[PDB]
Design an enzyme around this catalytic site. Structure first.
Site, PDB file in Angstrom:
ATOM      1  N   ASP C  16       0.822  -1.192   0.000  1.00 60.65           N
ATOM      2  CA  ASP C  16       0.000   0.000   0.000  1.00 60.65           C
ATOM      3  C   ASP C  16       0.885   1.284   0.000  1.00 60.65           C
ATOM      4  O   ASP C  16       2.139   1.163  -0.032  1.00 60.65           O
ATOM      5  CB  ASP C  16      -1.138  -0.088   1.054  1.00 60.65           C
ATOM      6  CG  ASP C  16      -0.664  -0.142   2.489  1.00 60.65           C
ATOM      7  OD1 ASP C  16       0.606   0.211   2.619  1.00 60.65           O
ATOM      8  OD2 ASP C  16      -1.401  -0.484   3.412  1.00 60.65           O
ATOM      9  N   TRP C  46      -8.332 -29.972  -8.195  1.00 58.50           N
ATOM     10  CA  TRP C  46      -9.761 -29.808  -8.029  1.00 58.50           C
ATOM     11  C   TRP C  46     -10.451 -30.093  -9.318  1.00 58.50           C
ATOM     12  O   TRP C  46     -11.630 -30.401  -9.341  1.00 58.50           O
ATOM     13  CB  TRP C  46     -10.221 -28.421  -7.514  1.00 58.50           C
ATOM     14  CG  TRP C  46      -9.672 -28.011  -6.192  1.00 58.50           C
ATOM     15  CD1 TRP C  46      -9.356 -26.747  -5.841  1.00 58.50           C
ATOM     16  CD2 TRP C  46      -9.373 -28.845  -5.050  1.00 58.50           C
ATOM     17  NE1 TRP C  46      -8.875 -26.707  -4.568  1.00 58.50           N
ATOM     18  CE2 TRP C  46      -8.864 -27.988  -4.048  1.00 58.50           C
ATOM     19  CE3 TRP C  46      -9.479 -30.223  -4.778  1.00 58.50           C
ATOM     20  CZ2 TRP C  46      -8.469 -28.480  -2.786  1.00 58.50           C
ATOM     21  CZ3 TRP C  46      -9.083 -30.701  -3.549  1.00 58.50           C
ATOM     22  CH2 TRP C  46      -8.582 -29.840  -2.559  1.00 58.50           C
ATOM     23  N   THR C  58     -12.214 -26.622  -0.993  1.00 61.49           N
ATOM     24  CA  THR C  58     -12.369 -26.447   0.448  1.00 61.49           C
ATOM     25  C   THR C  58     -12.611 -25.021   0.931  1.00 61.49           C
ATOM     26  O   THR C  58     -11.705 -24.360   1.458  1.00 61.49           O
ATOM     27  CB  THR C  58     -11.221 -26.976   1.275  1.00 61.49           C
ATOM     28  OG1 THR C  58     -10.045 -26.326   0.861  1.00 61.49           O
ATOM     29  CG2 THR C  58     -11.084 -28.464   1.081  1.00 61.49           C
ATOM     30  N   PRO C  59     -13.847 -24.563   0.763  1.00 64.76           N
ATOM     31  CA  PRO C  59     -14.247 -23.234   1.180  1.00 64.76           C
ATOM     32  C   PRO C  59     -13.937 -22.977   2.642  1.00 64.76           C
ATOM     33  O   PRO C  59     -13.889 -23.860   3.499  1.00 64.76           O
ATOM     34  CB  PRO C  59     -15.773 -23.187   1.134  1.00 64.76           C
ATOM     35  CG  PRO C  59     -16.236 -24.593   0.861  1.00 64.76           C
ATOM     36  CD  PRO C  59     -15.029 -25.364   0.351  1.00 64.76           C
ATOM     37  N   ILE C  60     -13.740 -21.722   2.937  1.00 64.47           N
ATOM     38  CA  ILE C  60     -13.442 -21.372   4.293  1.00 64.47           C
ATOM     39  C   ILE C  60     -14.714 -21.059   5.094  1.00 64.47           C
ATOM     40  O   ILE C  60     -15.663 -20.422   4.634  1.00 64.47           O
ATOM     41  CB  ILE C  60     -12.311 -20.351   4.129  1.00 64.47           C
ATOM     42  CG1 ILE C  60     -11.552 -20.130   5.371  1.00 64.47           C
ATOM     43  CG2 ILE C  60     -12.807 -19.067   3.515  1.00 64.47           C
ATOM     44  CD1 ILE C  60     -12.489 -19.792   6.544  1.00 64.47           C
ATOM     45  N   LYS C  89     -16.701 -33.113   9.374  1.00 67.59           N
ATOM     46  CA  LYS C  89     -16.867 -32.648   7.994  1.00 67.59           C
ATOM     47  C   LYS C  89     -16.099 -31.343   7.738  1.00 67.59           C
ATOM     48  O   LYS C  89     -16.410 -30.573   6.802  1.00 67.59           O
ATOM     49  CB  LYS C  89     -18.335 -32.374   7.640  1.00 67.59           C
ATOM     50  CG  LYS C  89     -19.370 -33.409   8.051  1.00 67.59           C
ATOM     51  CD  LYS C  89     -20.764 -33.063   7.555  1.00 67.59           C
ATOM     52  CE  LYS C  89     -21.385 -34.101   6.608  1.00 67.59           C
ATOM     53  NZ  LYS C  89     -22.747 -33.761   6.141  1.00 67.59           N
TER      54      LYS C  89
END
Lengths: 139, 139, 139, 139
Positions: C16, C46, C58-60, C89
């Site tokens: 930044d 995947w 594998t979503p968070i 799971k």
């Protein structure tokens, strides 16, 4: 060293719902490639330069790109960069990007010409300068 | 003004091949949301502050987020932000993100607590400071 | 292989105006790191999985991060990732990020725990599933 | 509707250490602008189209951009987009970007011509198609 090579792996997040590299990402990598070229040539980081010479970097003024093939996650890109032409206070940076798919396929993915300039903070905004002679030497 | 609302439209490029918002993007929007909160509260841009007080902004020190629902392009998010708690040289910024699907569905998408601090350039690195009293006043 | 290491160079654009890595970028790299862990463990991309098993990735679901030190361009990060805990799971993915400055300084930059799940497209939205036994085996 | 306008606020994270908008970001906004043009024209989301017609969107094939002025956080950009020319299976998308600084200054920031095509998933890769007649109608 006039032609510099850089690799970049494509990640899952770098792709759109369509499953291919989202375009704007290529500009991110060419930006890195550009910068990587001077460093690999011998230039000092912008960090030093910015104090030593007062050079903030090399903003882009123009650019032309052609995409010929798609790319996706897992594929590795090979970026080839060189200085095509030196002008008075600007230069032409050329990038040829090739994609290596799993299974070793190799296709040219993109080509782009970026016109950039050495610049410094001139009061309110940035100002271009003549390319330092030790930079032309180095490159 | 303690609770500030901000909208953000989700674009195609903001999604992964899986068709849902790519996670890291939510942090981009919360960053904007954070900043948008002080400005909407009355604070001056970091630009002024950085010269006036020498405050470079509010770097993040910690954060906790929970994602409960997915989101995709075209959906609009509503971001609600407030200051949960003030500590000595840091504060707790709370964000509640809700998704409005086409067809007006509204589900909470995410919640996150960001622990940030006011900071300044201290020679080599950044240093935290006590939250200025006019900032606590304003917020 | 339970603990996987990954390197990442920081570019100029990843910072930044304050001159330090812009936060959201760290999530980009951890996302890559996460994914890099299964691949390095033996899992198939995947791409295959999504057809073979129908697993989209594998979503968070949750995550907790603490930033202890700054980082900037030119610095190289070392990312260490392992599976902390397996639930029914879902699993706990742990990442420890260290920064190596020019001049070989080495400081821990960040730590983060990401709670993720194996998922599939369930009609309208994504659905979690029990972690496949060959995945637990592999990891 | 041939000429469509879109606004975009510049955030702090969208800028580099040099304090100006990091270039690749402009491509992100033009991508959004492009897409925003068809939607504003009447086209259905890619979501529908992708099932209805099997059109995945409009990948870019070429592009030419010139940056004439800098931009920074807090500034708001106005994006003007129209279809310059229709070819057989591709079109020329024109974007003119103007910057409005605090204090109401207004300068042209950038101009870009993007050559794109309507495309579909053709087995392995994407394939271009003749622009549907209801799209030319709409635009």
């Amino acid at each position: 060293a006039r032609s510099i090579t850089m690799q970049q792996r494509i990640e899952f997040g770098d792709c759109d719902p369509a499953g291919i590299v989202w375009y704007p990402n290529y500009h991110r990598w060419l930006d890195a490639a550009s910068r990587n070229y001077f460093i690999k040539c011998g230039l000092p980081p912008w960090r030093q330069t910015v104090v030593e010479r007062g050079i903030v970097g090399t903003p882009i003024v123009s650019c032309n790109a052609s995409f010929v093939c798609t790319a996706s996650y897992d594929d590795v890109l090979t970026i080839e960069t060189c200085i095509k032409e030196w002008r008075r206070k600007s230069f032409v940076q050329r990038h040829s990007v090739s994609r290596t798919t799993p299974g070793g396929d190799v296709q040219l993915v993109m080509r782009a010409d970026e016109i950039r300039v050495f610049a410094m903070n001139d009061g309110e905004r940035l100002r271009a300068i003549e390319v330092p002679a030790d930079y032309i030497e180095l490159c």
